[PDB]
Amino acid sequence: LDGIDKAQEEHEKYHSNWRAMASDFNLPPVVAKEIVASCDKCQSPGIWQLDCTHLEGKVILVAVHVASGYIEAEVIPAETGQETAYFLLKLAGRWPVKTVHTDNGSNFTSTTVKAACWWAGIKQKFGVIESMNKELKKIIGQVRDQAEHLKTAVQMAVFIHNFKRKGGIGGYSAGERIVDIIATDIQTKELQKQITKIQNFRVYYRWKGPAKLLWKGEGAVVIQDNSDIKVVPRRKAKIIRD
Amino acid sequence: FLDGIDKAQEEHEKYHSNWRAMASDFNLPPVVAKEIVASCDKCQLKGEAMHGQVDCSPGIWQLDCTHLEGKVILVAVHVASGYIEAEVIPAETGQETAYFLLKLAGRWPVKTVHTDNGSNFTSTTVKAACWWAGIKQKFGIPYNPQSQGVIESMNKELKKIIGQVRDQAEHLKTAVQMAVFIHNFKRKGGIGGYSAGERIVDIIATDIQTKELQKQITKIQNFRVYYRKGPAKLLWKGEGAVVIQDNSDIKVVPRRKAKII
Amino acid sequence: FLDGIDKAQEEHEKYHSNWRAMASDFNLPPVVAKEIVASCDKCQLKGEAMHGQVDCSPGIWQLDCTHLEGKVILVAVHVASGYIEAEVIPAETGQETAYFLLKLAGRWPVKTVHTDNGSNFTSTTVKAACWWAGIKQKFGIPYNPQSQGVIESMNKELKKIIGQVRDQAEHLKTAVQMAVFIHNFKRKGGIGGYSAGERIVDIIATDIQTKELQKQITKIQNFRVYYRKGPAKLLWKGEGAVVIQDNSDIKVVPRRKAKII
Amino acid sequence: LDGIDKAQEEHEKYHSNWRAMASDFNLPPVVAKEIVASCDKCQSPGIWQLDCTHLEGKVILVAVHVASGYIEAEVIPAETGQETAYFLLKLAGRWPVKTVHTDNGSNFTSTTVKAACWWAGIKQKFGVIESMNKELKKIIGQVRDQAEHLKTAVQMAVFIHNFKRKGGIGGYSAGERIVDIIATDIQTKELQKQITKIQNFRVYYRWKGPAKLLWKGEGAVVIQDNSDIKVVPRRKAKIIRD
Amino acid sequence: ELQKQITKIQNFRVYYRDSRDPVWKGPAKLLWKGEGAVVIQDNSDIKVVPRRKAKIIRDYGKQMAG
Amino acid sequence: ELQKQITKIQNFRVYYRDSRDPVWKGPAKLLWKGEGAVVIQDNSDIKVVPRRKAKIIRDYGKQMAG
Amino acid sequence: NFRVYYRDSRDPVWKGPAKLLWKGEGAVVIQDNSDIKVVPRRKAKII
Amino acid sequence: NFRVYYRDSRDPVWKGPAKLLWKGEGAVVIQDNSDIKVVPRRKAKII
DNA sequence: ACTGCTAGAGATTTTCCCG
DNA sequence: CGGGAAAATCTCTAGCA
DNA sequence: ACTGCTAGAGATTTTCCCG
DNA sequence: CGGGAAAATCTCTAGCA
Ligand SMILES: C[C@@H]1CCO[C@H]2Cn3cc(C(=O)NCc4ccc(F)cc4F)c(=O)c(O)c3C(=O)N12
Ligand SMILES: C[C@@H]1CCO[C@H]2Cn3cc(C(=O)NCc4ccc(F)cc4F)c(=O)c(O)c3C(=O)N12
Ligand SMILES: [Mg+2]
Ligand SMILES: [Zn+2]
Ligand SMILES: [Zn+2]
């Protein structure tokens, strides 16, 4: 409430994103979002990639979360549409899958995979998959002796890649990265939902012209008028729906 | 009561009358009648009326095999979140249960699996699958599905969803995957208004974030506290109350009669 | 919400999401999401969470046939008191059920018998036995033993007692009679600290005494009451409140705005 | 409390039983019992009778409550100890049976009947049964045509005798009489239990010598001293157990 | 006459149940009995209870205690 | 430094259960997490809750409402 | 007018909707395709 | 010392008495004739 | 030495919203 | 501060087989 | 137009009993 | 009026199959 001006100044100085401002100054995220959206000089997690690898005569079907390097893979009996659609429906049930990238192969452009995408709500679009292929094959070659079949080896390989190999800026593994990115997406969806809810409300304060509503606090009401954010007492402003 | 008690045991040896009947018919105090009933082996036929409370740690998963349309569905659930994984398998065999377990341990951080004493879960092939993935096996008390209440309740929700979508799939495996999707991402409610997927993401993300934060706090905040004792390690302070750990025993003491060094 | 509702039905037609999920994903009021869920036939899969309440009139008896050691035990119970009658019979046949019913109706005043829809109770021989004794037959909703909760619970206490005394009898009929004796006269507790026999005696004795007393009171106390209406028949007066019966409708009115003639 | 003297006078005049005094004057039944027990010039429901009747070649085994005329009867296959003991155990389970009168017949003096009496707590002792035999046979002869077997006729006869034929001073049937008599016995047993409980208590009031305790009210304590009943406040008397 | 009858009918205790409460309510005081409804007094409150929900007794244990 | 970390760890909500109550208690405020026990604050009261009885979240719905 | 979805007898499949004819305390009488049935209120939902 | 009567496994006959070795929250460990068993506290009575 | 639970339906209490 | 409506909490049940 | 209940085990609140 | 102990009330569960 009191730090809106400090936030506006810090953004005009450093062009910071709304998350830091809501964290540093203790502002409702909607207000910081409006701060970053008020300057015109200041202006992925559902994106999986699908490919098929051949090894020892069986077909391995790999799925990679681009943002995180997280790998979903399993051995399928035949490079067919049935199994591809089954795999993709499974994946859509495990993680939130919003769009899948494929190599326009016969098994990816079938009618069954398309129907599975339609039901699961996935968008289909026809180089990270190749590097992840190479790394997964490397790990399988490491760990093959510890199993008898190839499906078990593949799963042990996926476990090792997802949770035992760490790297990047912070030294996190792919599982931690995926959890973090999906959590950030949950935050973004919730913030968008709340903004969409409040955007259909108009506020008349002190009477003055209608203004966009930003926050409905327990001791204040935050409003934006003429590209300027002002704080008014709840008893000094009436909120109506339009 | 020496005449009244001796007749009460003689009557109890025949009819096994409860404490009330023997108190009314022989003029006995309630404690004496209750003692007479409590010494009869043939009258101890009821356990105590409570329920236990299953483990809900973030790494706890409950697995169970359920049947539908002659097929076997191996179901897992994250207890803290309710996020479920399921798969139609041709046989309740330790081989395919171990396969399901290795897949699960590769997709999510699984620290401990809780199962009943089915032959597929108690198999030596699952033991090797748990040992390689570093999973701890916690078997329940035999013939007590209450110890697996979370997964058994999940066997009901999953079946209830499958019947809702069974006419949108030719095969039962497709319907099982549709049901998993629907439960995990289209049913909201619970301890955060979340769905199961949102909730599970919250639990692991919170676990890592809080572990890192508390590691930093303990690295910085380093104090010893004397109260009433030894130099207990400081844990938290504020609002006129101090929480400390004295010899691996967490207790709460007020700010008075407690000094921080 | 015209764009938000049309997408919600389209998503519900696939996943059958509950009202919360459709309110969060499409920005809907709770009433609109609940309306969308309430119009889907495939989502009405749960009844309301309550229980009914069986008839406990003084003339109500519940009968049921239970099995033990390959023999058939026909059990009856007085619902208001818990006094039970039982008998080992060679077959679940309307003939012997009618015999048991005629014996029971001859020993106690039986006004109505409540049973499930077993073949022995729904038999035409029991109907004649009930018609001759002036008994009314009340059958429960099929496959709902909850409608016979009193007798079904009595099937458990009776079996529990039999196992306590089964080693004092060579035959099972002797043990059944011992158990009936023990339940009826050696187990105290309930709504008067009574046993089942004492309690049943209290219910019928009270029924006759109160019927006679109220007959006398109504014969003497003859008044008409006007309140707020017609000349309602007076029932009771005192403590600043009047109870009357206006056109077969008992209601309580205060002493004010009420005159007794 | 206040009517103890009126009760004492009414008893010295009319020699009334304690029940009327407790009902007319509103006295605890213990106090009225002590009133009737203080004068020396003023000084059955568990008694069943058993006999066997022969009719149409089968043996009917009848039980009669002497105090009430209530009849328990059923046809048995053989005049044997097994069936007699079964019948008597059944009866002891239905009603409170305390002593049974028999005609010293072979089936009544067996070891099985004696053991059944020992288990059920019944005392065995070896003209109402004959009159009840005659009445039951009369009713069976009336109602025989309405049945095919004889056991069913006998049971219909028992129902008619117990609940459809009425007589006596008040015009009550045998069932109402038995219920009433058993209820009066319950009252008597409860009163005896309470008297036995209170008889082991001594009261010291105002201190005076020990006195027998009669009632422990909410505003008073009733005591009997030197064959004279007096009322003292609870705070003016201490009760001890001896 | 009538008053004795009324204070006699009021000596009977009534255990009853409401249409949605599974637990039995404590002993009330019978004011009026009918073929289908009984009128009681529970804790200075007058309730009308159907005959199928009420278990009227007299408690001979209590008549003899006081 | 440390204060920011402490008021960050206190932003996490904790649902917990007592050793004999089957119902989940509302969102508390996390004060300290440990390997086997968590220290919370429910309605101006400091409780110690084992790790197996607690569900700690952050409610992203709420972080974004206020 | 009320729609009633019920669970009639030893059958896990829910049926309905049916007309409400009588709502009692604990049980309800409905009409499902010219067939009169009595179902407890634990096994019915009324809308 | 405590006597424990229990109901072990898919068996309606109650057994006991057995020595109490460990009372947990929801389950108990006992010793019945040199045989160690774990029984929930719904299926045991301790005296 | 381990452990009933989950989600929905109806009822009842809280909170908020404009006077 | 006062009602009404909507939201939140509470209570309770089947099914897991 | 019909309907869960009963008795026991442990916990918690009430009542009483002597100061 | 104040604790302690005993009694009364409350809460909750298996089994009825
Ligand atoms: C042969 C394995 C090992 C040995 O035991 C059997 C028997 N069993 C029985 C049920 C069952 O009927 N559950 C209903 C239920 C009842 C109470 C409760 F608290 C929880 C509940 F889920 C199962 O679900 C189940 O998986 C098994 C099983 O797996 N096995
Ligand atoms: C062939 C007749 C007629 C058609 O129905 C069957 C089936 N049935 C089932 C049970 C039973 O499982 N009771 C456990 C229980 C469950 C719930 C509840 F509320 C009360 C309870 F007693 C019986 O006792 C019983 O007598 C019968 C029976 O007689 N029949
Ligand atoms: Mg039956
Ligand atoms: Zn015993
Ligand atoms: Zn639907």
Q: Is the CB of B140 under 6 A from ligand 1?
A: no
Q: What distances in angstroms separate CA C129 from CA C97, C101, D144, D159, F18, one per listed residue?
A: 9, 7, 15, 12, 57
Which helix (DSSP H) or strand (DSSP E) does residue C246 occupy? none
DSSP output for D168-232: TTTTEEHHHHHHHHHHHHHHHHHHHHHHHHHTTEEEEE--PPPEEEEEE-SS-EEEE-SS-EEEE
- Name the minimum distance, in Å, from the CA of C11 to any CA of chain B: 9
Which residues are within 8 A (CB) of A36 and not within 5 positions of it... i.e. 6 or more apart? A11, A16, A17, A18, A21, A42
Q: Could you give the angle at the alpha carbon of G28 between the alpha carbons of G26 and G29, nearest 5°?
A: 155
Q: How many CB atoms lie within 10 A of CB A162?
A: 25
Closest CA to E35 of D173, C210, C234: C210
Q: How was this structure determined?
A: cryo-EM
Resolution in Å equals 3.0
Nearest one of A101, A41, A81, A67 to A181, comparing CA atoms: A67
Please tell me the distance in Å from D129's CA to the nearest CA on chain B: 31
Question: In this complex, how many residue pairs, one in chain B and one in chain F, have their CB atoms less than 8 Å apart?
Answer: 87
Breaks following residues of chain B (C-to-N distance > 2.5 Å): 228
- Please report which ligand is nearest the Cα atom of C152: 2
Domain coordinates in residue numbering, chain F: 11-57
Q: Which of residues 26-55 of E touch D (CB under 8 A)?
A: none
**8-state DSSP, B135:** P
* Subunit contact A93:B173, Cβ cutoff 8 A: no
**Protein-to-nucleotide distance from the CA of B146 to the C1' of I4, whole angstroms:** 5
What gap in Å lies between CA B97 and CA B90, rounded to an integer? 11
Q: Which pair of structure tokens corresponds to residue B6?
A: 């001796």
Q: Tokens 């007590």 sit at which residue?
A: B144
Q: Which residues of A touch B173 (CB under 8 A)?
A: 86
Residue among C114, C116, C123, C48 at smallest CA distance from C80: C114
Rounded Cα gap, residues C53 and E49, in angstroms = 13
**Are C223 and C243 contacting, i.e. CB atoms less than 8 angstroms apart?**
no
Out of A86, A96, A158, closest to residue B106 by CB: A158
Contact (CB<8Å) C20/B189: yes
Q: Is the dihedral of CA C108, C113, C114, C120 positive or negative?
A: positive
- Quickly give E65 CA vs L8 C1' distance in Å: 17
A neighbours by CB contacts (3+ pairs under 8 Å): B, C, F
For the sheet with H36-40, list strands across it. Answer: H36-40, H27-31, H15-23, H3-6, H44-46
- DSSP string covering C186-223, please? S---STTS--HHHHHHHHHHHHHHHHHHHHHHHHH---
Would an 8 Å CB–CB cutoff place B117 in contact with chain F?
A: no
Instruction: Look up the protein residue whose alpha carbon has the minimum distance to the C1' of J9.
Output: F26
For B33, residues 6+ apart whose C-beta sits below 8 A from its C-beta are: B8, B18, B19, B20, B22, B23, B26
Q: State how far the Cα of B154 lies from the Cα of C213, in Å rounded to an integer.
A: 60
- G43 CB neighbours in chain C (<8 A) are 47, 144
Q: What are residue B230's phi and psi, to 5 degrees? A: -80, 175
Using the CB atoms, write b or e for C34-64: b if 16+ within 10 Å: bebbeeeeebbbebeeeebbbbbbbbbbbbb
Q: β-strand D172-173 against B232-238: which pairing, if any?
A: unpaired
For the sheet with C258-260, list strands across it.
Answer: C250-254, C241-245, C232-238, C224-227, C258-260
Closest Cα to residue C115, out of C88, C155, C162? C155
H-helix or E-strand spanning residue B15: helix B2-15
- Burial per residue of H23-43, b for 16 or more beta-carbon CB atoms within 10 angstroms, e otherwise: eeebbbbbebeeeebbbbbbb
Residues from chain E that touch C210, judged by Cβ atoms under 8 A, are 9, 12, 30, 33, 56
Whole-number Å distance between alpha carbons of A60 and A188: 34
In this structure, what DSSP letter does residue A125 have?
E
Cβ-Cβ contacts under 8 Å for B224 (sequence gap 6 or more)? B231, B232, B233, B234, B260, B261
Distance from CA of D196 to the nearest CA of B (A): 8
Ligand 1 and B156: CB distance under 6 A: no
CA distance D86 to D77: 12
Which residue is associated with the tokens 């979360």?
Answer: A65
Q: Which ligand is nearest to the CA of C34?
A: 5
For the CA of A96 and the C1' of I8, the distance in angstroms is 26
Q: Do F63 and A215 touch (CB under 8 A)?
A: no
Q: Which chain B residues 106-135 have CB under 7 A to strand I?
A: 114
Question: Which residue reads 């629907």 in tokens?
Answer: B182
| Listed residue (E28, E57, C194, E64) closest to D23, CA to CA | E64
CB G16 within 8 Å of CB G46: no
Neighbours of chain D (3+ CB pairs under 8 A): B, C, E
Q: Residue C252 is part of which domain span? A: 222-261
What single letter denotes the amino acid at residue A102? T
Contact (CB, 8 A) for A54 and A105: no
Give me the sign of the Cα torsion angle F44, F49, F51, F52: negative
Q: Which residues fall within 8 angstroms of residue B34, CB to CB, at 6 or more apart?
A: B19
Chain C CB contacts of B15 below 8 Å? 165, 181-182, 186
The answer to whether F45 and F66 have CB atoms below 8 angstroms apart is no
Dihedral in degrees, nearest 10, Cα atoms B108, B114, B118, B120: 30
Point out the ligand nearest to the CA of residue B63: 1
Residues C18, B42: C-beta atoms closer than 8 Å: no
Structure token pair of residue E53: 């929900």
Buried b (16+ CB within 10 A) or exposed e, B72-99: bbbbbbbbbbbbbbbbbbeebebbbbbb
Do B244 and B225 form a contact (C-beta atoms < 8 A)?
Answer: yes
- What is d(CA B68, CA G24) in angstroms, rounded to the nearest whole number? 36
The pair of structure tokens assigned to C204 is 């019928």
SS3 sequence, C78-94? ECCCCCEEEEEECCCCH
Pairing of strands D123-125, D99-101: parallel
Q: Distance between CA D102 and CA B208 in Å, rounded?
A: 88
- CA distance linking residue C55 with residue C147, whole number of Å: 9
Query: Which is it for strands D237-241 and D229-232: parallel, antiparallel or unpaired?
Result: unpaired
Contact present, B162 and B84 (Cβ < 8 Å) = no
- Give the pair of three-digit tokens for residue F16: 């917990």
